[PDB]
Structure 1
Amino acid sequence: KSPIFGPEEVNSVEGNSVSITCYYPPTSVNRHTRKYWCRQGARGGCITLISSEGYVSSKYAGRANLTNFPENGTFVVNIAQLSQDDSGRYKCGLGINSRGLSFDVSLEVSQ
């Protein structure tokens, strides 16, 4: 089992903003390793929407920021300007996209 732990189910109306915290065991790898928030699509894999090194995707440009509180032991993803393409299945995680170390947030926007 993978020790990240986020919010399992998030609900927020279009136009409003989301803050999603995900926790990690505050090691000295996990403080400094790459922290992502990828969109698990259909037919395959994570497509990293906003990494923590400084990538921010074409979609989430101007509307998302991922920060990292390593002493608090957590990292937080703020996403403003939701729409109904922001619904679906997301992962908040650490390290590489493929190798687990993640948690599965299910973002679900309402009208």
Structure 2
Amino acid sequence: LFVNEESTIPRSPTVVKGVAGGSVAVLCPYNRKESKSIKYWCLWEGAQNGRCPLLVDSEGWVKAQYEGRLSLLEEPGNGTFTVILNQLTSRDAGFYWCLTNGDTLWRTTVEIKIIEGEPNLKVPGNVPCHFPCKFSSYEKYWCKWNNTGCQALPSQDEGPSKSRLVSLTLGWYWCGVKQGHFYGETAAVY
């Protein structure tokens, strides 16, 4: 093996540690030339066996424990994407692979170091939600969680209000911050 030190592969944040009960954001680069076929996203069993467990796929099939609390959301379309995982369980600590069944198969790896602490957005619905004013420079949003496709639906859409909230006055739902191009953390309501 010879490892070229002048590589076209861009930098990927090796670790994206986050608050227990909160959420993360994993931007996985892929070959711009060839667009995606199946954005497989995996785990590790061990350092030797390490059979990765496709948590999610482009179809939308999700695993048992991440059923609901996990998503992959293509955009930032220009040759990468953003897989999210809200509701900060500890056990989730490990390494995640951004598989694709294109050609140049970089299997970029990212380490998720989970640390217990204050959650940046509020609790569980029925519909509380909260993100710090410093984190609020963006646009706290809500999505109705679908393993096929995340679709935004109405909630409290105002300034910081206790800060966020969720209302569905008349399932699994998400209440998260969005940068626009990219995306910030999540929120899990029922």
Can you give the 5+ residue segments of structure 1 that lack an aligned partner in the other structure? none
Check the 8 A contact 2:29/2:108 in 1, yes or no. no
Identify the match of residue 83 of structure 2 among 72, 77, 83: 77
TM-score by length of 1: 0.82
- Is 2:113 the counterpart of 1:108? yes
Check the 8 A contact 1:35/1:95 in 2, yes or no. yes
Higher strand fraction (1 or 2): 1
Match of 2:23 in 1: 17
- Is 2:37 the counterpart of 1:33? yes
Mapped partners of 1:9, 1:60: distance in 2:
20
Match of 1:95 in 2: 101
Aligned alpha-carbon RMSD (Å): 2.3
* CA displacement at 1:52 relative to structure 2: 1.8
Mapped partners of 2:80, 2:31: distance in 1:
9
Deviations 1:24-82 (A, max 9, x none): 1212xx31311111001223311111112221111211101101137422111111001
Check the 8 A contact 2:43/2:97 in 1, yes or no. yes
Secondary structure, in 3 states, of the residue corresponding to 1:59?
coil
Corresponding pairs, count: 107
Q: Which amino acid aligns with 1:74?
A: T
Mapped partners of 2:45, 2:111: distance in 1:
12
* CA displacement at 1:100 relative to structure 2: 4.8
Match of 2:66 in 1: 60
Higher normalized contact order (CA 8 Å, seq sep 6+, divided by chain length): 1
Mapped partners of 2:86, 2:108: distance in 1:
21
* CA displacement at 1:11 relative to structure 2: 1.1
Q: Which amino acid aligns with 2:100?
A: L
Q: Which amino acid aligns with 1:69?
A: E
1:40-51 alignment, distance < 5 Å: 40-42=44-46, 43-51=49-57
User: Runs of 4+ in structure 1 displaced over 6 angstroms?
Assistant: none
* CA displacement at 1:110 relative to structure 2: 0.6
Mapped partners of 1:12, 1:21: distance in 2:
15
Q: Which amino acid aligns with 2:93?
A: S
Mapped partners of 2:95, 2:70: distance in 1:
17
